[PDB]
Design a protein around this ligand. Structure first.
Ligand SMILES: NC(=O)c1ccc[n+]([C@@H]2O[C@H](COP(=O)([O-])OP(=O)(O)OC[C@H]3O[C@@H](n4cnc5c(N)ncnc54)[C@H](OP(=O)(O)O)[C@@H]3O)[C@@H](O)[C@H]2O)c1
Ligand SMILES: NC(=O)c1ccc[n+]([C@@H]2O[C@H](COP(=O)([O-])OP(=O)(O)OC[C@H]3O[C@@H](n4cnc5c(N)ncnc54)[C@H](OP(=O)(O)O)[C@@H]3O)[C@@H](O)[C@H]2O)c1
Lengths: 397, 398
């Protein structure tokens, strides 16, 4: 009865999202999709118990199985180590995973019409895929800061004066970017664009950063022309370098519906529970979907105290739908593909139908005016989603 | 009758804003203020004709008279050069003015109670000051790209490795910042905060890019505690640090009304550009260059040329004038001018709040598809309305 979704690496996360994860899996995914589940519990405790080995495993697992849907996970800091008596301040599992899988993250603000956007003109969502450490430092007083490139082939070492501080000090920094990374960024971006049939857009400062950002413009254009150009048009889709400036202006002027590859991480005034991240690996096959938000600690605390919480599961639900959608794509799993979509549709519809969590209700009536009667609580919204998903899916088969 | 405004460096601009600009002068400023006007025509034709000499002169002028009220000017691109048959693709005069003058730009969306702020909370305006270039190269193939510091004295030689390329080459860059620039940014910022009696916040990464943004947080605290914490507290105002992640949130949960000093690598936000004012605040505390944050509003100008009715928001440009005048007034302690500058700012907001507003604003309130010809006034109706309300406001006050 259920549809074999195939193998999917699922990563359990922490706190509120972990609570929602089980609801999403319980109400929205399991009842309709059978999955060869490579479930890894990236719960903060389990990452501790397993010395973060589980994070690396879930990574190698995603590397292996191409599809990773990840629940928000606590990234340990001073407080976390203290709260969980962590044997260590573990690296962000995202960092670990992202470093293992490489790839470019793509945050899509999933948009409901009755939900105010930065630009109410964006009926089509905007997929922003950011690129990526920088070497900043002292400079206490006068002296030359020179950035130096020494070829490994022992040919002439190149020295660029980045600045000669004569008066007082200041601060300097080195940044770099491997062609490889720019290429990955390119492929992940073109890949992502084709994936959603939406036009790609590389925004850089090709002008002020001639050699540097130009390298992106070039590499992108080069990977596009010699790898995706035909593939694009053959979809009405099209890539195009846009100066950060003309690009930000274009977006506001646009109704959205385009992939935006940035080259400079919260920002944005839209609801966090509607922000879906997707680590699109260059290979075009590996993908890791996850809510862009975190474990929603504040909500969890409330949940811990037995208080009514109104956490938005959409970003997590969409992590599932995006991963599953990708699973489907990879496996030509047209039933799973439809389900991923149906679930995305049902999620948006449920919200566009007036049923939402407090945060969304707050996007509409402003926090101060949000009444208990304006939103459903976490469980209530989840149920609603399930009911409609049940409905939506019945309407097909 | 008219109040002695003093010397003000005015820069006529281009297209739609050029129209609104002359309207603002003709209807809002000149009837009430006599300025020793240093008008510079930064119109695209004139800049071309004078080989952008006018732009440098205007900048030179602003530096001399400490006050520039600049109209939006066409920054030439490829289409521009073709269009105006420009002799060259002249730099953004803003750029030129900016290079010449230096200082921190402070953008302020002038707030109207009946116009949706990005955050319904924002009752008072949030004035964002942005800092202010780098040596970037290709890095052919593999090899160590390492940034090196060498004190002039020779005491040390710190060479950090930005990156050791192994998998082919890529692209590296070195960026820097003199404390002067940061200090400047701090003064501009602290003085801006004083000038407008609003707490000053500084936001940085100060974690991921620690050291770099750290020198900012420091040089700010240091300039604050050493030159400003006095004047600040002695005005129910102050300064405080913050992380971009904390500011973006601390802001939402606030009535706005603070000088926000950003430090990134701009300034497009929700609402309307017609309400975006921009002020170049030079560190010296004396030189200022007010201007609409928006451009010449070409789409509106094209319409205007086709004879179509336009509804351009003069508010930004009007506040370019009022802020320029307010600052001229500050420098001369011109009570009257200072009053007018504010009265004009008052009339502009009170008019809009009174329901009389250009289409862009009506578009904010209602939404584009729901805006009717009756929900707004065209460029000129609005200007008249502001004018009439300014006469009223300026008549009743005395
Ligand atoms: N694994 C990841 O991708 C990831 C990413 C970020 C953070 N985290 C972890 O999240 C834990 C807490 O982080 P955080 O609280 O800073 O970030 P967060 O969980 O994103 O919290 C953001 C705040 O935004 C609102 N919010 C965010 N997501 C929401 C949702 N789905 N539904 C309803 N409201 C939502 C809540 O504020 P209101 O109180 O105003 O409702 C929430 O407290 C931290 O340990 C962080 O490490 C994980
Ligand atoms: N010197 C400056 O200060 C400055 C700054 C920026 C740009 N510019 C020059 O501006 C010229 C055109 O810029 P642009 O095309 O980006 O236009 P703009 O002047 O930047 O504004 C573009 C769009 O913004 C909206 N807008 C801006 N100001 C408005 C106002 N007062 N009232 C109503 N709507 C307003 C309009 O959108 P709607 O189409 O929806 O009405 C306008 O078409 C370019 O040459 C640029 O170089 C000059």
């Amino acid at each position: 009865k259920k549809i074999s979704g195939g193998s999917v690496v699922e990563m359990q996360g922490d706190e509120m999202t972990r609570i929602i994860w089980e609801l999403i899996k319980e109400k929205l995914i399991f009842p309709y999709v059978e999955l060869d589940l490579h479930s890894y519990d990236l719960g903060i405790e389990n990452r501790d118990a397993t010395n973060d080995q589980v994070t690396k495993d879930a990574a190698e697992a995603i590397k292996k199985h191409n599809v990773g849907v990840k629940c928000a996970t606590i990234t340990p800091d001073e407080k976390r180590v203290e709260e969980f008596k962590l044997k260590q301040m573990w690296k962000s599992p995202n960092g670990t995973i992202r470093n293992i899988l490489g790839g470019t993250v793509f945050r899509e603000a999933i948009i409901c019409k009755n939900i105010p956007r930065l630009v109410s003109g964006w009926v089509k969502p905007i997929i922003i895929g950011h690129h990526a450490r920088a070497t900043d430092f002292v400079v206490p007083g006068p002296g030359k800061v020179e950035i130096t490139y020494t070829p490994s082939d022992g040919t002439q070492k190149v020295t660029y004066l980045v600045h000669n501080f004569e008066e007082g000090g200041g601060v300097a920094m080195g940044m770099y970017n491997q062609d490889k990374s720019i290429e990955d960024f390119a492929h992940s971006s073109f890949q992502m664009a084709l994936s959603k049939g939406w036009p790609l857009y590389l925004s850089t400062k090709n002008t002020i950063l001639k050699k540097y950002d130009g390298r992106f413009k070039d590499i992108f254009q080069e990977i596009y022309d010699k790898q995706y150009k035909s593939q694009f048009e053959a979809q009405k889709i099209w890539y195009e370098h846009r100066l950060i400036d003309d690009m930000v202006a274009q977006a506001m002027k646009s109704e959205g519906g385009f992939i935006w590859a940035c080259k400079n991480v919260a920002q944005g005034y839209g609801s966090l529970g509607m922000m879906t991240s997707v680590l699109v690996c260059p290979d075009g096959k590996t993908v890791e979907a996850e809510a862009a938000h975190g474990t929603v600690t504040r909500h969890y605390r409330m949940y811990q105290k037995g208080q009514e919480t109104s956490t938005n599961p959409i970003a997590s639900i969409f992590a599932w739908t995006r991963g599953l959608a990708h699973r489907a794509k990879l496996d030509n799993n047209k039933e799973l593909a439809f389900f991923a979509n149906a679930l995305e549709e049902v999620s948006i519809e449920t919200i566009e139908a007036g049923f939402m969590t407090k945060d969304l209700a707050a996007c509409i009536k402003g926090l101060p005016n949000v009444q208990r009667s304006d939103y459903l609580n976490t469980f209530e919204f989840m149920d609603k989603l399930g009911e409609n998903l049940k409905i939506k899916l019945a309407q097909a088969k």
